From Swiss-Prot:
Component of a histone demethylase complex with RCOR1. Component of a RCOR/GFI/KDM1A/HDAC complex. Interacts directly with GFI1 and GFI1B. Interacts with INSM1 (via N-terminus). Component of a BHC histone deacetylase complex that contains HDAC1, HDAC2, HMG20B, KDM1A, RCOR1 and PHF21A. The BHC complex may also contain ZMYM2, ZNF217, ZMYM3, GSE1 and GTF2I. In the complex, RCOR1/CoREST strongly enhances the demethylase activity and protects it from the proteasome while PHF21A/BHC80 inhibits the demethylase activity. Interacts with the androgen receptor (AR). The modification N6-acetyllysine is found at residues 261-262, 265. Its EC number is 1.14.99.66. Keywords: Acetylation, Chromatin regulator, Chromosome, Coiled coil, Cushing syndrome, Developmental protein, Disease variant, FAD, Flavoprotein, Isopeptide bond, Nucleus, Oxidoreductase, Phosphoprotein, Repressor, Transcription, Transcription regulation, Ubl conjugation. This is Lysine-specific histone demethylase 1A. Induction: Down-regulated during neural differentiation in neuroblastoma cancer. Residues 257-336 form a coiled coil. It comes from Homo sapiens. It is found in: Nucleus; Chromosome. The gene is KDM1A. One of its GO terms (cellular component) is DNA repair complex. FAD binds at residues 118, 137, 139, 145, 161-162, 616, 625-626. It is linked to Cleft palate, psychomotor retardation, and distinctive facial features: A syndrome characterized by cleft palate, developmental delay, psychomotor retardation, and facial dysmorphic features including a prominent forehead, slightly arched eyebrows, elongated palpebral fissures, a wide nasal bridge, thin lips, and widely spaced teeth. Cleft palate is a congenital fissure of the soft and/or hard palate, due to faulty fusion. Acetylated by KAT8 in epithelial but not in mesenchymal cells, thereby regulating the epithelial-to-mesenchymal transition. Acetylation by KAT8 reduces KDM1A association with nucleosomes, thereby decreasing histone H3 demethylation, leading to transcription activatio of target genes. Polyubiquitinated by JADE2; which leads to its proteasomal degradation. Deubiquitinated by USP38; preventing it from degradation by the 26S proteasome. Its cofactor is FAD.
Amino acid sequence: SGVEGAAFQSRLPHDRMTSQEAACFPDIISGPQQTQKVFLFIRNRTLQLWLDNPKIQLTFEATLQQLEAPYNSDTVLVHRVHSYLERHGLINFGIYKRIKPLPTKKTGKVIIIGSGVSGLAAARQLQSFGMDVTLLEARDRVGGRVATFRKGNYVADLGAMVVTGLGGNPMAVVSKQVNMELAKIKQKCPLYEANGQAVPKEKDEMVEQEFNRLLEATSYLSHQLDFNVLNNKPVSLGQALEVVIQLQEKHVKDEQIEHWKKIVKTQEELKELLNKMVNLKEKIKELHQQYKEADITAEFLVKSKHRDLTALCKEYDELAETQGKLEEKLQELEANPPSDVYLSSRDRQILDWHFANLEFANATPLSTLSLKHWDQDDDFEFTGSHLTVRNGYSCVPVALAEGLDIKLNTAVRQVRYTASGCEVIAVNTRSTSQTFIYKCDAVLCTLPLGVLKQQPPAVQFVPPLPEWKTSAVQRMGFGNLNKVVLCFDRVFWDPSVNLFGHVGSTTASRGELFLFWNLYKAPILLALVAGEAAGIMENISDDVIVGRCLAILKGIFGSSAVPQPKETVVSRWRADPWARGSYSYVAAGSSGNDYDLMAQPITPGPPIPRLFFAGEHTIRNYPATVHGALLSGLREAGRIADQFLGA
Ligand SMILES: [C]C1=C([C])[C]=C2C(=[C]1)N([C][C]([O])[C]([O])[C]([O])[C]OP([O])(=O)OP([O])(=O)O[C][C]1O[C](N3[C]=NC4=C3N=[C]N=C4[N])[C]([O])[C]1[O])C1=NC(=O)[N]C(=O)C1=N2[C]([C][C]=O)C1=C(O[C]C2=[C]C(F)=N[C]=[C]2)C(F)=[C]C(F)=[C]1
């Protein structure tokens, strides 16, 4: 349906109130059921009005005007609902034409550290709410881990790059607002072995299905058998994977042993049977000789010796009957061995390609992921096909930057917060002698987890953060992932495929240049560096790693088909001091609960909160994504406005 779709698109149950709404509307949950049903229709229709046209502000007045009778009659309730939705960023979020110009007199000073999607999203909210917002950003550009390279006619994303499904995705709104050109990804992804030979279809399918089987087995191990702690240590996904492969190898070795035992036993029966047939041939040779040597007892001696000869001959024909039914069992046993090994060497390399794919998705070696919780956010996937941004994902944060007070090249070094307000201290990255002091009522920290983990610290907190926050920082994973961008003057790959895989020769390096990505109709190739390779490869110069790319591609398509690239780019997210990695992951011994701890604001001791946190690492249900960063910015804007302007 139409207004039900709007609730789904807002990640809300269309037919019941959330706990959050129950808190804000206690008179509804405790009141008659009929009024609760009225509430839900107001909410859904208001969201639809916004979502049908997110390019302009949806005001209370326009909501009231577009509600049909009787709903346009309960003005107070309509306003309450509109107000709630607006405060939580469910309407009037992103970038839109304001009908009511911004209030000229402000209320509260908020410093936002970082101009990534989370910082920008919060800034636009807080500015809409009438506050004085200033973003301090260390880079010379906005977007943070959204980073688009442009040179000549080439455009390519170095950070985030995919919109996952649009159904339920707040980025769907931003797409309409900003005019992102989205393009569906074709799912076919051919694999090539390290010699450049294509992986045959059967091997591709066999290994992939086994990969799915192994992984489902780890999840059974974890969530049915409660095999989550071992020798006082939390189990990692990599560990469980090694265990389930070891058991398959054991099983293969068993069926091989059973089969060899059947072989040996049949050989032993043949040896025995032949020895017995031998002695019966000798016995018949003796009777056949005493049969030609032949009175009345003699005329009866021949009858008896023929009865004896042909009875031994019946014994012998029956034993050669068993001889045949046995060496017929032997022949098909030698012709039907069970698998010699679990995984051929080539099979293993291909399986390591799928593991690399998973290390790409989580940005970290599998041996670091929590077995129990690494995919705790699975249940929140959006519906619809994934897409890429043909005009470059930076268009989103660049559009969000319009009109904001943003100080670039301004690196926060220290954050002071007391019960009387806050001070943020920063240096000019082009002249680190120049120092700045920003007084404010509240600080929103969107510093990446990688920056928070940095030892010695990049940013100093005064007073230091509480143990519950720092130890959550300590526990959480922050992974890495890098790209080689290859710009050519001609397209030599299969234009109808967006993806193809290079199977690494060894397990340790399975993530090196394992995936080649294709951007729609454009002579660009992205090669991914995942897993253990991602951090190590940062120590390789651009020219050498490009050379390794070209060697792979020449192996796949032919040495003369691959020209020299016109432009190249290489991400080094770990070494980037403003990222110190790519995005969080649930490390073994962490859990979704640590993301909630990350989101919790700090209050100086006996009082009201001063220091707030947003960023992809603060949102339990959508971590490590652009939309999660966005949603987290909206969440904190709501929390801060609730604090400083009232619920
Ligand atoms: C890095 C990365 C990469 C490479 C990739 C990716 C990613 C990443 N992602 C994630 C995102 O991006 C995130 O989440 C966000 O971004 C976050 O945001 P925030 O939170 O806000 O943060 P930032 O941005 O960083 O911001 C912050 C700020 O701050 C600043 N600073 C620092 N320090 C300082 C400062 N200031 C001052 N002071 C001081 N001291 C900085 O600078 C900044 O600004 C993502 N996501 C999404 O959604 N998408 C995508 O795409 C992504 N990605 C990826 C990975 C994985 O896999 C993904 C994917 O894939 C896809 C692809 C890509 C490529 F490239 N190629 C191919 C393919 C998927 F599929 C999915 C997902 F989800 C993800």
